[PDB]
Amino acid sequence: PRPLRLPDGPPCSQRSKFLLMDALKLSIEDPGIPLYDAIKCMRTFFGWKEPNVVKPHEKGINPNYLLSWKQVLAELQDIENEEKIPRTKNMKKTSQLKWALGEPELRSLASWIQNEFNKACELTDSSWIELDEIGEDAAPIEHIASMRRNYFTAEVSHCRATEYIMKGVYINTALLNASCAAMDDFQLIPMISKCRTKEGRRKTNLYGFIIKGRSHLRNDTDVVNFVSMEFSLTDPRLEPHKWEKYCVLEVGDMLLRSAIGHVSRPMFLYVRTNGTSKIKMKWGMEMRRCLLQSLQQIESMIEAESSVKEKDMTKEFFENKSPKGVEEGSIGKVCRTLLAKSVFNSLYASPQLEGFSAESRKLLLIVQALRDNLGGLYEAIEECLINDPWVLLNASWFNSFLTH
Numbered sequence: 001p002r003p004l005r006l007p008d009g010p011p012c013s014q015r016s017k018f019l020l021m022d023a024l025k026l027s028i029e030d031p032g033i034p035l036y037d038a039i040k041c042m043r044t045f046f047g048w049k050e051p052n053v054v055k056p057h058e059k060g061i062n063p064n065y066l067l068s069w070k071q072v073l074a075e076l077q078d079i080e081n082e083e084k085i086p087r088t089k090n091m092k093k094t095s096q097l098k099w100a101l102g103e104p105e106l107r108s109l110a111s112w113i114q115n116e117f118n119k120a121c122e123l124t125d126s127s128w129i130e131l132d133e134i135g136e137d138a139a140p141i142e143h144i145a146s147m148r149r150n151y152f153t154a155e156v157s158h159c160r161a162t163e164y165i166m167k168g169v170y171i172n173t174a175l176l177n178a179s180c181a182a183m184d185d186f187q188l189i190p191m192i193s194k195c196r197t198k199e200g201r202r203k204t205n206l207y208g209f210i211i212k213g214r215s216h217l218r219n220d221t222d223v224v225n226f227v228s229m230e231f232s233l234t235d236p237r238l239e240p241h242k243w244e245k246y247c248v249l250e251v252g253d254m255l256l257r258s259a260i261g262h263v264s265r266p267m268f269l270y271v272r273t274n275g276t277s278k279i280k281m282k283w284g285m286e287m288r289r290c291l292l293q294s295l296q297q298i299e300s301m302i303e304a305e306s307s308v309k310e311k312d313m314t315k316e317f318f319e320n321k322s323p324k325g326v327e328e329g330s331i332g333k334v335c336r337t338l339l340a341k342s343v344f345n346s347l348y349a350s351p352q353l354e355g356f357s358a359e360s361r362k363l364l365l366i367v368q369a370l371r372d373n374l375g376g377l378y379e380a381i382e383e384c385l386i387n388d389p390w391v392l393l394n395a396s397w398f399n400s401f402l403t404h
């Protein structure tokens with residue numbers, strides 16, 4: 001009956017482990033060691049300038065974030081003089097890094113998280129996975145399953161949510177490996193991804209750096225702290241509420257092709273302290289399963305049309321030949337919307353998300369039963385609507401489904 005009661009308060013703020021729509025890549029074309037790749041990426045940019053804070057972290061020590069970035073640059077400059085470029089780089093345990101590495105309450109839905117989700121559904125001009133990326137099969141797959149995987153892949157291989165998948169897989173792999181290979185060190189860990197242009201060129205991408213703290217992770221739940229430093233062209237002063245947890249530097253200027261001619265835009269560095277655990281880094285390494293999970297949701301839809309029409313409906317589904325249209329607009333957009341929901345469930349995982357997902361499915365089945373044939377549950381759901389952007393956006397969406 002009643003729409004969900006969304007909490008009131010200041011707008012919700014970004015809480016992902018890395019930047020999503022706001023990320024910026026420094027890239028090298030047709031390039032294997034992350035630190036060497038990062039330096040060559042840094043040396044493609046010439047608009048660096050003396051960094052200063054432009055959006056302070058309200059609760060943190062902003063001079064230390066500034067000092068940490070200047071330390072990163074200074075220590076990368078050192079590596080450029082040591083004879084062979086080493087495989088890894090352990091930061092000096094400066095006072096700013098010791099500080100930064102660490103050695104109720106209601107928020108309202110803000111529009112940025114819907115925007116993030118729309119962005120995750122879009123196509124980029126690069127492919128982020130190989131043609132045989134999806135799946136774990138010991139054996140050759142049957143002909144129909146293959147056809148389905150190939151159709152699905154063509155629709156998501158360039159999708160932005162797939163870039164998020166591989167970005168997350170890379171940085172979680174690197175952090176987890178560093179966590180046992182360099183337990184006592186403040187290791188400098190580049191944030192790298194890899195894609196292939198439409199013309200087939202291989203590109204290596206640098207988003208920024210993380211620095212991990214001490215990581216004596218005896219448990220799955222033991223926490224390793226880190227400082228993330230991420231490039232961006234997003235001016236934080238347009239949506240300051242999004243950036244509550246960040247100190248934001250201006251660190252350069254970049255010359256860009258636009259719908260106008262060439263333009264110069266400031267380049268920013270989003271800095272925050274964060275943490276993660278073994279168990280979260282292991283899930284982060286498994287994000288390719290989002291591809292598999294959303295494929296299987298698509299296969300479900302094909303199997304239902306295929307039993308009803310007593311023929312295999314794979315070609316007629318993906319080619320859009322019973323239904324007379326596709327509400328999202330195209331088969332492609334449906335695949336990418338399913339993918340983005342799955343990826344965002346992983347990026348924004350939480351107990352709030354878990355509680356909302358189960359209790360809201362109960363209210364949905366009940367409400368459909370009422371729709372087709374005509375207190376307590378509401379408290380379990382709304383006990384999860386506190387301050388998480390992804391949960392709040394999903395509750396917003398649920399209320400659309402209640403109005404329709």
Ligand SMILES: Nc1cc(Cl)ccc1-n1ccnc1
Pocket residue numbers: 039042043048049073074076077
């Ligand atoms: N320090 C540094 C290191 C690298 Cl690999 C690239 C650029 C710089 N740099 C120069 C001026 N501002 C920053």
Ligand SMILES: [Cl-]
Pocket residue numbers: 133134135136288289292
């Ligand atoms: Cl997989």
